[PDB]
DNA sequence: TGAAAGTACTTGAGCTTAGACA
RNA sequence: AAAGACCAGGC
DNA sequence: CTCAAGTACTTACGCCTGGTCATT
């Protein structure tokens, strides 16, 4: 079965979408857990969002998993414990000699006025999730799970890959800008050194993963009802092989 | 409408040959009386056609105009087609 | 279409407050004594000063009289006359101020070139 | 190395590729001529292409010479690779066997590049042919069961299922199809004298007429002036029904469709009664008139005696009859055919006779018909339509159609009435002046300076015309603002345009107020320079004590101000017109035709207009532009400028020429149905469920459409 | 029309006007730093954009397998015959398709245009 | 299938040697079904440990540990499409790697190895699921393939010489897709290797035999060149029912 | 410029002179076809801040028939048109006791301009007309047929004659821009001759609703 | 891993005022 | 076996 | 109260052959 490449970045253009320029990468973490969460990097086009847009074509947006709606980039960067604008700017464009590509990021920074700080980037993450927090710590810990876990999980999944995060993020809107500038070719889906073939082994792998969860979903659920005697707890009765077979 | 003042075409269209002489081969089919004379003819669609050819099928077409009212063309004041 | 009404509608606010308060401010000056200038007080160009026109005039005198030590032309009171009516035209043939002033340079140089081509500057 | 210049419309890469693609299909046109050249009268291909039972000359040139440029989309074989076709090229290869022409032929055998070249080629039909049949089944159903009802009732009268009428006769003329033929005119272009020369039966001679009458009817010719008042008579209608044609038929088109062959049922007579064109005919000019305007009576299409019916008639079998007069005229006769008496009574009843067969019969069901002889050959068509570039085929008849609100390409021929039309620069004036022209696409560049005072110029080249400007009794004492917008104007777009710093400047007055200063180089110049600041001051009052929040620093509001300059200036053209192309066109359908003095045809090559985008009321509004033949291909805006009928003819004329791109041909009567029942309630009503389920139709003919549950809802 | 950076917090510094002598000043609006503008122009727009590529062409393309390479057109700097040419390969750069010769060689990365 | 929109449908360039052109079923299912080529062979999927320890044994940087003002001139690095560092010498660094997977030391010859060099980046594919092909190796303008390797596996019986010991004496590599779009190939040696008018001296690969690119059932028409692709395309989806 | 402006009002001038012709209105020879310079000579030239301030460029013009009724060509100077230029204008249009007249707006009109419009349909007519739309005479285009007006008694004859009920004839809403150049309300029929190229001419009725 | 479009709904906006004569 | 889905294939 | 500018439904060839599978 084909299927698009995964962990790569991929730059695409819709004819009508709001978009001018999009960025994806359908990251899954070594094939371990997860079908894949994908993320989306893009370009507001030209029409103008009623007070900043008035120069060739800006406003780089995010647009993350397991949230409602658009999130500018920058805040997303901030939300990375990357306050000052320099080290954004360092991690997004790698060669400050350039000025054509800094015009274009410029009004990226200048919708991320108001958000200067870490852990209210995170709120407002947070307050754009699934279901808003009714507090603020636990938006605070929503919005840090999904940065961290379920965002670009490739990169890095646990605690201190938030630097290799940024960087990968910084090397997204790198492309994306590339792209804005025309210094490279926006990427072909029908290139097939974009697709990936899920023979016997992938199938079945992604099959028997989910096969064995739910296996032990239902082996749990056996030990929580035999347990609440307190007696003892068997498991050659607890398994139910009809359900791999 | 009346006999006088018939406002269609004189020619018989090819639907109401179709039509009629179906109608009469099925006629004949079922015992009815033919009118021409018939030279060995078993097979009622012939002695339909021929019947038609001599213009002595005892039907009357009832043309309906768009309005609602019909004129009533005999096949014989009907002129062939053939 | 939608945007030309909103455009329209924040140029002219956000410059109208910076007109500030008393907006007023005409004080059209007639023609002192002796502007060589016909039709005068005319108001048909707004913000166009008679003495910006009289301005355009001398400078048109300046270019005529570096024409005249060019080509040798007749005398200075016809040259007079001659700026009166290029300064006339200009002004007919012009609907806003910057236009007019634009229009009176655009014929200097015409005038110097002309010069500047040693031929005297015709019509 | 940058000696190729770019061909007007099309970018540097555009005009490449055409000068590649033309030297390769002359070579491959060139070999196929001198593959087919060689062939023996033996040869079997040869033997097969001629007889046309299969295969044609590109067959014989791909199998024998070159098989040709494959191409992908209707273009040269892309890059899929990084500027390559395939690895085994070098990158930035535009060479013919890079990019996919095939030099070898099928008999030598293709090397492996043109083989991959030519399965991207074969798999180009492939994708065609399995995907266009299921649009097309689509438009078929829809077409079928928006026709389905319409019906030629006992009247002749076409009317769908709520007997609302939509064509009075059939075809406009109340005969089927099945029996007509191709036919010509023979009056319709003749140059004047030549039409005297042909039909006006001159007696005068005395020795034609012995020639060629019998020496009995000769002297009763002559001497009888009834008879020559008749002849002259007859001409003269003959000459009316000329004018007629003329008006009917622009562009001198001669080749019609009518009933029955008149030049064939008299070679017909001609051989079935032995005539001798060597001898002269027996056959009296009178006898020849009587018997054609006798005839033309009983050739009746409306039947009845109201001057309404008369008319009906008239109009009716009004071109059959002037076909009929110009054939059976009685110096043909006489001249050319030479026929009989008794041919020419036989000529007579058998014209009556098979006329009279061509009559559509009433109960015939018109609309299923047209339905499906429209349907039909869209499955022969392609689906794709690949310098002006026009939707065709399957997609341009979806598009007719459904009415689509936004076709594809929307665009609007335009005609030139005066000197325009043949002199190129007053063509290229009308282009630049229907051509959307905003700033953006005449400056070269455009910053943001900061001048404290208008003398400094941060800028070292203004200073001169600055200086220039600020020594008058200026708004400079004043606080003059400081931020300065200085644009730089492309002297090649400024002049390919002939636009002029006095117009840019008026229109920047006009569009801003006169709060807005405007400095610029008036040319003769290196640099078409043009300086504007934003000088609003305070009128010389005192400093400023708590301004405004929403005071929009001068900066930004600067950046707001070229913004909309630079996006919404408008300072040529017409808006919705993205581009003009300017061509002389070489078909006659886009030719100016004119009926010179001696009353010929001659076609005038006249420049025409052709736009991206549609505005045809503002179009036709401008000068110079001809009102009478301007038009435009989407039909929405033709509702909403010209009327209900004038988009009848237009959706006829898009129809048919999306029929007959391919060269295909579909009988008239067909488009007029399609277009009647598009264009009968008044509005333009869609075929497809919106505007068919519009209709006040029976909800059971609904259901069987796209909607059943939801109009038995509504029922 | 670049860009310039605060030196307390590291954020953008905006243009501002010095209303009481009249100079531009660059004042960034996360702190009260006020900086000279040196250059005293803020924003510079190439719609037509004749930039040139080989300020955007790197030297190691030299050494890319997939490229033509002639020794017709040498070095300016260092003469070498063998230099590597292809074109614009960039998006948006109007309707070009001239050549741009890259040195082969190695440490000479030198590039032209004819 | 139901889609009409005929751009996947189209063969691409990309499928050269990789999935047969010709062979592909009629109906709704043209192009979007795709059967592989003779010599495709499927990656099957590494652990990319070895590669990631390899390269911080030769240097390079981490991204932790990096500066960002000197990633400009550096070459990214990335496996399996994590980045993991720049590199500051990509042409010692790629002919290193190349070394290793020939000689399949460190790096199993499935894993694809790419330096695109106008955009800095060099990624490194240990992934399931990539689609590659063997392909002859070129040094200078001469094949890897010799003599002696031909001999050798014309007694291939009872020597246990194969072709797994002819890709381990680095004379046959696997190269995918994205890996072949940084490559240049050459049809024949006899023709395209030899001195001729000049056209390109850079070979770095040749195919085995071009006949390879068609598929199983486009194998077996004879003179497939001669014949009009869509026949091909007909054949090959003809040969599944013929009967024997 | 103002060259323009004069070209535009010439022009308006001319097709709203055919139209009033083409509805059986006296309109004079001369007047029908006149050049622009005759026209600037006879209205003054420029019109901004000249001779011919939108006011007595207006039209009144008689129908042939009768010149009773009359009919009385309309010209607001305002780029849009309110209701109390309207309401000055029909106390105008009820001093001269007239019933038809036209409107011709530079741009556009308020809804409540539109809605006293339509307000009266009995005591005075009154058409409204884009400036833009008056720029080209639509009835001399290529695609549009001529269109003739049909008296009642024609009307009547003709369902007489092919025995038709009014509805079963072809529509044409009374929005239609030749519709509307007629100046034709609901309930009339518009006779339609457009040439063919299967029978030579083909009469079209098309019921206005 | 990548419809496309036409139609039926809502919802927000949003525009000088003053008394006498009239 | 019944209708449901899926798949492959012919024109 | 009343106009243009966002959110929901609704549909995408004609048959024809067969084989397999889970529910019933
Ligand atoms: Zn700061
Ligand atoms: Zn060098």
């Known amino acids: 079965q084909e299927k698009m490449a995964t962990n790569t970045v991929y730059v695409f253009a819709k004819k009508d979408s709001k978009y001018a320029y999009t960025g994806e990468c359908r990251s899954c973490l070594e094939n371990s857990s997860r079908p894949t969460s994908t993320i989306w990097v893009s370009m507001l086009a030209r029409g103008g969002q009623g007070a900043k847009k008035s120069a060739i074509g800006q406003r780089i947006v995010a647009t993350l998993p397991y949230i409602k709606q658009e999130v500018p980039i920058i805040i997303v960067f901030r939300a990375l414990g990357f306050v000052s604008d320099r080290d954004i700017l360092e991690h997004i464009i790698y060669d400050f000699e350039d000025p054509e590509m800094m015009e274009m990021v410029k009004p990226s920074l200048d919708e991320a006025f108001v958000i200067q700080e870490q852990n209210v980037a995170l709120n407002f993450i947070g307050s754009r999730g699934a279901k808003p927090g009714v507090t603020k710590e636990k ?36 492309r994306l800008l590339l792209a804005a500038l025309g210094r490279r070719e926006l990427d072909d889906r029908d290139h097939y050194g974009n697709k990936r073939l899920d023979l016997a082994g992938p199938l079945l792998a992604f099959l028997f993963r989910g096969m064995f969860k739910n296996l032990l979903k239902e082996v749990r659920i056996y030990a929580q009802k035999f347990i609440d005697r307190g007696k003892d707890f068997n498991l050659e009765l607890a398994i139910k092989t009809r359900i791999i077979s | 409408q009346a006999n006088q003042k018939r406002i269609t075409t004189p020619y018989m269209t090819k639907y109401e040959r179709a039509r009629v002489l179906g109608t009469r081969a099925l006629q004949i089919a079922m015992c009815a009386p033919v009118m021409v004379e018939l030279e060995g003819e078993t097979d009622p669609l012939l002695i339909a056609m021929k019947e038609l050819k001599a213009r002595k099928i005892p039907i009357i077409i009832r043309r309906y105009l768009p309005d609602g009212s019909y004129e009533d063309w005999g096949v014989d004041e009907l002129i062939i087609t053939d | 279409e939608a945007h030309k009404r909103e455009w329209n509608l924040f140029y002219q ?110 019509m | 190395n940058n000696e190729l210049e770019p061909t007007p419309g099309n970018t540097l890469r555009q005009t490449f590729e055409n000068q590649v693609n033309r030297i390769l299909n002359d070579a491959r046109d060139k070999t196929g001529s001198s593959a087919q050249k060689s062939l023996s009268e033996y040869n079997n291909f040869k033997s097969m292409v001629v007889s046309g039972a299969k295969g044609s000359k590109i067959n014989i040139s791909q199998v024998i010479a070159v ?57 180009e039909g492939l994708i065609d042919t399995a995907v266009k049949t299921a649009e097309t089944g689509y438009i078929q159903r829809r077409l079928i069961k928006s026709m389905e009802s319409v019906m030629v009732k006992y009247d002749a009268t076409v009317r769908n299922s709520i007997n609302q009428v939509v064509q009075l006769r059939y075809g406009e003329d109340g005969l089927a199809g099945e029996s007509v033929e191709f036919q010509n005119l023979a009056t319709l272009k003749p140059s004047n004298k030549a039409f005297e020369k042909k039909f006006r039966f001159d007696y005068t001679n005395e020795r034609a007429l012995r020639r060629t009458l019998q020496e009995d009817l000769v002297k009763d010719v002559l001497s009888n002036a009834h008879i020559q008042n008749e002849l002259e008579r007859e001409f003269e209608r003959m000459r009316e029904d000329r004018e007629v044609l003329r008006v009917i038929f622009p562009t001198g088109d001669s080749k019609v469709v009518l009933p029955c062959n008149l030049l064939r049922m008299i070679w017909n007579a001609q051989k079935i009664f032995h005539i001798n064109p060597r001898l002269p005919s027996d056959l009296h000019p009178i006898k020849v008139v009587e018997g054609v305007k006798e005839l033309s009576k009983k050739l009746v299409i409306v039947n009845g005696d109201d001057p309404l019916s008369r008319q009906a008639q008239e109009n009716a079998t009004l071109l059959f009859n002037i076909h009929l007069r110009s054939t059976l005229c009685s110096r043909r006769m006489a001249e050319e055919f030479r026929l009989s008496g008794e041919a020419f009574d036989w000529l007579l009843g058998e014209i009556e006779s098979k006329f009279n067969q061509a009559i559509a019969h009433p109960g015939e069901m018109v609309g299923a018909l047209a339905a499906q002889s429209l349907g039909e050959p869209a499955t022969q068509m392609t689906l794709n339509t690949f310098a002006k570039n026009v939707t065709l085929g399957v997609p341009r008849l979806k598009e007719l159609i459904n009415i689509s609100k936004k076709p594809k390409t929307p665009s609007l021929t335009v005609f030139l009435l005066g000197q325009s039309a043949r002199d190129a620069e007053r063509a290229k004036d009308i282009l630049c002046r229907l051509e959307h022209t905003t700033l953006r696409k005449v400056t070269a ?83 078409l320079v043009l300086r504007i600041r934003i000088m609003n001051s305070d009128e010389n009052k005192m400093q400023e004590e708590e301004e405004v929040v929403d005071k929009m620093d001068d900066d930004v509001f600067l950046r707001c101000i070229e913004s909309n300059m630079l996006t919404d200036m408008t300072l040529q053209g017409i808006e919705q017109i993205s581009k003009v192309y300017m061509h002389l066109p070489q078909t006659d359908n886009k030719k100016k035709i004119i009926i010179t003095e001696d009353g010929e045809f001659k076609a005038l090559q006249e420049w025409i207009l052709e736009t991206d985008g549609v505005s045809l009321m503002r179009v036709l509004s401008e000068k110079d532009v001809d009102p009478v033949r301007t038009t435009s291909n989407d039909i929405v805006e033709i509702f909403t400028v010209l009327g209900i009928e004038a988009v009848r003819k237009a959706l006829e004329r898009e129809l048919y020429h999306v029929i007959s791109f391919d060269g295909s041909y579909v009988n008239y009567r067909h488009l007029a149905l399609l277009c009647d029942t598009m264009t009968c309630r008044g509005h333009l009503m869609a075929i497809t469920r919106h505007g068919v389920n519009r209709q006040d139709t029976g909800p059971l003919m609904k259901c069987s459409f796209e909607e059943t549950v939801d109009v038995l809802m509504e029922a | 029309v670049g860009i310039r950076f605060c030196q307390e917090c590291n954020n953008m510094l905006y243009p501002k006007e010095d209303k009481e002598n009249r100079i531009l000043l660059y004042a960034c609006r996360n702190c009260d730093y006020q900086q000279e503008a040196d250059n005293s122009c803020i924003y510079v727009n190439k719609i037509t954009h004749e930039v040139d590529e080989l300020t955007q062409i790197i030297a190691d393309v030299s050494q890319d397998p997939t490229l033509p390479r002639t020794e017709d057109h040498p070095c300016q700097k260092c003469g070498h015959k063998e230099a590597v040419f292809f074109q614009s390969h960039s998006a948006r750069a109007e309707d070009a398709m001239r050549l741009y010769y890259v040195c082969t060689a190695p440490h000479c990365g030198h590039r032209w245009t004819e | 299938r139901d889609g009409k929109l005929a751009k996947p449908r189209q063969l691409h360039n990309t499928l050269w040697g990789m999935v047969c052109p010709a062979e592909t079923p009629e109906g709704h ?24 320890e390899f390269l911080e044994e030769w240097s390079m940087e981490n991204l932790e540990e990096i500066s960002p003002a000197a990633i400009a001139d550096a070459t990214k690095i990335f496996v399996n499409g994590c980045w993991v560092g720049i590199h500051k010498d990509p042409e010692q660094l790629m002919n290193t790697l190349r070394k290793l997977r020939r000689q399949m030391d460190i790096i199993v010859s499935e894993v694809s190895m790419i330096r695109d060099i106008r955009e800095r980046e060099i990624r490194i594919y240990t992934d399931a699921g990539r689609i590659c092909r063997p392909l002859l190796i070129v040094e200078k303008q001469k094949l890897l393939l010799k003599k002696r390797h031909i001999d050798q596996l014309k007694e291939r019986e009872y020597n246990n010489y194969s072709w797994q010991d002819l890709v381990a004496s680095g004379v046959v590599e696997y190269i995918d897709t994205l890996e072949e779009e940084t490559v240049m190939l050459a049809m024949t040696p006899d023709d395209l290797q030899e001195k001729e008018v000049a056209y390109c001296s850079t070979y770095t690969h040749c195919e085995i035999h071009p006949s390879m690119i068609l598929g199983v059932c486009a194998s077996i028409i004879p003179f497939p060149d001669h014949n009009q692709s869509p026949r091909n395309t007909y054949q090959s989806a003809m040969g599944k029912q013929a009967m024997g | 410029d103002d060259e323009e402006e004069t070209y535009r009002l010439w022009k308006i001038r001319k097709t709203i002179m055919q139209l009033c012709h083409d509805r059986g209105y006296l309109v004079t020879q001369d007047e029908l076809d006149q050049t622009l310079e005759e026209f600037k000579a006879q209205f003054g030239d420029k019109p901004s801040e000249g001779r011919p301030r939108r006011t007595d460029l207006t039209v009144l013009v008689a129908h042939n028939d009768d010149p009773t009724d009359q009919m009385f060509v309309f010209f607001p100077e305002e780029p849009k048109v309110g209701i109390k230029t309207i309401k000055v204008y029909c106390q105008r249009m009820q001093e001269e006791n007239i019933t038809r007249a036209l409107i011709v707006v530079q741009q556009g009109m308020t809804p409540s301009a539109k809605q006293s419009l339509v307000d009266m349909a009995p005591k005075y007519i009154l058409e409204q007309f884009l400036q833009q739309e008056l720029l080209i005479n639509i009835t001399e285009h290529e695609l549009v047929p001529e269109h003739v007006v049909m008296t009642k008694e024609e009307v009547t004859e003709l369902l007489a004659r092919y025995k038709l009920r009014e509805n079963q004839l072809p529509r044409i809403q009374a929005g239609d821009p030749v519709a509307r150049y007629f100046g034709i309300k609901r309930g009339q029929v518009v006779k339609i001759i457009r040439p063919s190229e299967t029978a030579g001419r083909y009469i079209t009725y098309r019921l206005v609703q």
């Not at chain 3, 005198?61 to 009171?77: F, G, M, V, W």
């Not at chain 4, 040709?68 to 060479?95: A, S």
């Not at chain 4, 200086?467 to 708004?475: K, R």
């Not at chain 6, 979007?32 to 070895?50: E, F």
């Open chain 1, 139 to 174: 938006r605070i810990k929503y919005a840090k799970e999904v940065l961290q876990k379920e965002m670009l999980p490739h990169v890095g999944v646990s605690d201190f890959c938030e630097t290799k995060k940024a960087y990968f993020l910084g090397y997204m809107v790198h």
């Open chain 3, 13 to 122: 606010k956000q410059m109208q407050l910076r007109k500030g308060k008393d907006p007023k401010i005409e004080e059209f000056v007639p023609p002192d004594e002796n502007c060589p200038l016909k039709e005068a007080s005319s108001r048909r160009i707004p913000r166009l000063t008679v003495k910006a026109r009289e301005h355009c005039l001398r400078l048109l005198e300046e270019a005529l009289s570096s024409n005249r030590q060019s080509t040798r032309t007749a005398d200075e009171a016809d040259l007079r006359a001659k700026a009166v009516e290029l300064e006339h035209e200009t002004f007919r043939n012009a609907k806003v101020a910057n236009l007019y002033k634009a229009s009176v340079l655009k014929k200097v140089a015409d005038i110097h070139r002309a010069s500047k081509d040693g031929q005297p500057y015709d």
């Open chain 4, 67 to 123: 098989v040709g440029q494959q191409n992908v989309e209707g273009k040269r074989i892309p890059f899929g690779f990084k500027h390559r076709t395939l690895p085994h090229f070098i990158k930035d290869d535009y060479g013919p066997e890079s990019r996919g022409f095939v030099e070898n032929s099928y008999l030598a055998g293709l090397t492996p590049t043109e083989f991959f070249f030519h399965a991207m080629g074969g798999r």
């Open chain 4, 445 to 527: 560049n455009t910053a943001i300076y900061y001048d404290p005072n208008p003398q400094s110029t941060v800028v070292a080249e203004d200073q001169e015309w600055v200086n220039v400007y600020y020594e008058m009794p200026d708004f400079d004492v004043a606080r003059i603002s400081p931020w300065l917008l200085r644009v730089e104007l492309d002297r090649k777009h400024m002049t390919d345009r002939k636009l002029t710093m006095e117009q840019i400047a008026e229109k920047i007055n006009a569009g801003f107020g006169d709060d807005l200063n405007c400095i610029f180089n008036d040319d003769n110049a290196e640099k």
């Open chain 6, 29 to 52: 299912a043209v192009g979007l079904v795709k059967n592989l080529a003779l010599m495709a062979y499927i990656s099957v999927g590494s652990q990319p440990s070895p590669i990631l």
